Amino acid sequence: KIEEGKLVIWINGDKGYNGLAEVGKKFEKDTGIKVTVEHPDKLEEKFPQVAATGDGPDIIFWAHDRFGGYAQSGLLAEITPDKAFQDKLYPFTWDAVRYNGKLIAYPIAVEALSLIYNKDLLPNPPKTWEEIPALDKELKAKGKSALMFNLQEPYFTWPLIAADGGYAFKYENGKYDIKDVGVDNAGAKAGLTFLVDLIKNKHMNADTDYSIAEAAFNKGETAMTINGPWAWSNIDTSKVNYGVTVLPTFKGQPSKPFVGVLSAGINAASPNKELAKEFLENYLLTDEGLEAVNKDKPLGAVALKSYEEELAKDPRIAATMENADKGEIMPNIPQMSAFWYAVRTAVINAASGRQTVDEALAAAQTNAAHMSAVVVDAVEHLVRGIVDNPDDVRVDLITSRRGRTVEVHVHPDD
């Protein structure tokens, strides 16, 4: 069980072995309550099991994308901050810690993709996607390219696709309409078409993945890449002279990257919910607290307005927050399995010419809107089985059972 009259906190070692602990000591000095920071292996996988039995930590620190499942299982306590504390943090950050219109965590830090550029090759990076083709033709004459980033993962390609109207699941009044999918609207098609045209006119290659793009940028072969703050320290050691800025606009509208929010959740089984609220609101989420943590390991852009104004004096942190403000918060709902599955396939097919942009995104619309996570797992399981089979496996099947038609086709490529 969880012991009364103390605080046990779980956070990943990569957020700082000393920082949060120092805030803990300050809390203990004022209140006499002992704060203990632990870093157990796979704590994101451990917490849901331990907490389901009424054990585990009082507080858990993790990216908001796991907090949806925890909230669904009734493992997180509903938090009760007043409009005053809430005004101290950026309004959007609160959207990452709402589940069925209920606040279930405190937002700490904000993370998102920015345009990373090589200042020696390109002192003035382009404001628009539209002017990249021209820039690439010019750079190709010097044996360089304009832009390389991961085309294989939707996380990276979505910002362009979403610029003119694309969305995953409609977010309005603190609620996700899981039936309102925005994968095959005019805007989605316009964006993916521009991406495919970049590949057709050989400004980009559909094969380019994360590691290939990182190699290219860090060797000074490409003037720009699209990546997050996790990629900065590799560039630092590379001694490429880099800047981080706002993502290019498409059709006059900003690229909309998905936003991840490091959050602090209170265990529903914790007998110390009031101590947790006191610690998180009045010791951690202050200039003094976030400074203690940041001095240990930098948080990047933070939810707390007062301290973000300080950190944003680093223009790379300012870039991260601007791109996050203009982006969309990544849905923490089960249907994102279907979204990722659908869109990953759709962009690989559109980039390879296997499907037209229209065909690809129409299919992805259907999949994202109508495939449960278990259905995705079943379909993928079948696909793996067949694809990994060495024999000449071919299928041309159409079966209709119980008012439902299922087709399966397996054949070599053309």
Residue among 263, 324, 303 at smallest CA distance from 44: 263
Provide the minimum distance between the beta carbon of 183 and its own copies in the complex, in angstroms, as a whole number: 11
Closest to its own copies by CB, 215 vs 386, is 386
Provide the minimum distance between the beta carbon of 409 and its own copies in the complex, in angstroms, as a whole number: 4
337 binds its own copies (CB under 8 A): no
Provide the minimum distance between the beta carbon of 382 and its own copies in the complex, in angstroms, as a whole number: 5
Provide the minimum distance between the beta carbon of 375 and its own copies in the complex, in angstroms, as a whole number: 5
407 binds its own copies (CB under 8 A): yes
Tokens (6 digits) for 408: 């399966």
412 binds its own copies (CB under 8 A): yes
How far does Cα 15 stand from its chain's mean position?
Answer: 17
Closest to its own copies by CB, 276 vs 371, is 371
The SS3 call for residue 175 is strand
Contacts with its own copies in 376-395 (CB under 8 A)? 378-379, 381-383, 385-389, 391-395
372 binds its own copies (CB under 8 A): yes
CB 387 within 8 A of CB 365: no
366 binds its own copies (CB under 8 A): yes
DSSP code of 251?
T
Provide the minimum distance between the beta carbon of 116 and its own copies in the complex, in angstroms, as a whole number: 31
* Residue span 46-85 as binding mask against its own copies, x where in contact by CB under 8 A, dash where not: ----------------------------------------
How far is the C-alpha of 314 from the C-alpha of 50, rounded, in Å? 40
Angle (CA) 391 394 397, round 5°: 145
Residue among 132, 130, 76 at smallest CA distance from 99: 76
Provide the minimum distance between the beta carbon of 394 and its own copies in the complex, in angstroms, as a whole number: 4
Closest to its own copies by CB, 237 vs 399, is 399
The window from 200-208, 241-249, 317-325, 374-382 that contacts its own copies (CB under 8 A) reads 374-382
Provide the minimum distance between the beta carbon of 120 and its own copies in the complex, in angstroms, as a whole number: 40
Using CB under 8 A, which of 149, 345, 347, 357 touches its own copies? 345
362 binds its own copies (CB under 8 A): yes
352 binds its own copies (CB under 8 A): yes
375 binds its own copies (CB under 8 A): yes
Question: At a CB cut-off of 8 Å and minimum separation 6, what does 373 contact?
Answer: 334, 335, 337, 338
Question: At a CB cut-off of 8 Å and minimum separation 6, what does 11 contact?
Answer: 20, 37, 39, 43, 60, 61
How far is the C-alpha of 254 from the C-alpha of 322, rounded, in Å? 10
The window from 88-96, 239-247, 281-289, 401-409 that contacts its own copies (CB under 8 A) reads 401-409
Closest to its own copies by CB, 87 vs 358, is 358
Closest to its own copies by CB, 33 vs 375, is 375
Q: How many residues interact with its own copies (rule CB under 8 A)?
A: 48
CB 105 within 8 A of CB 76: yes
- In order of 14, 223, 285, 364, 365, the CA distances from 370 in angstroms are 37, 40, 40, 10, 9
Tokens 């002192």 found at: 123
How far is the C-alpha of 123 from the C-alpha of 306, rounded, in Å? 31
373 binds its own copies (CB under 8 A): no
| Residue 371 identity | M
How far is the C-alpha of 325 from the C-alpha of 91, rounded, in Å? 10
Q: What are all long-range contacts of 71-76, with beta carbons under 8 Å and residues at least 24 apart?
A: 71/99, 71/100, 71/102, 71/104, 71/332, 72/99, 72/334, 73/48, 74/268, 75/47, 75/48, 75/51, 75/267, 75/268, 75/269, 76/104, 76/105, 76/265, 76/266, 76/267, 76/268
172 binds its own copies (CB under 8 A): no
Using CB under 8 A, which of 30, 177, 370, 373 touches its own copies? 370
Using CB under 8 A, which of 52, 212, 312, 363 touches its own copies? 363
Using the Cα atoms of residue 212, residue 218, residue 224 and residue 226 in order, give the sign of their dihedral: positive
288 binds its own copies (CB under 8 A): no
404 binds its own copies (CB under 8 A): yes
178 binds its own copies (CB under 8 A): no
Ramachandran sector of residue 253 (left: φ over 0; alpha: ψ -120 to 50; beta: rest) = beta
What is the contact surface with its own copies in residues (CB under 8 A)?
Answer: 345, 349, 352, 354-355, 362-363, 366-367, 369-372, 374-375, 378-379, 381-383, 385-389, 391-413
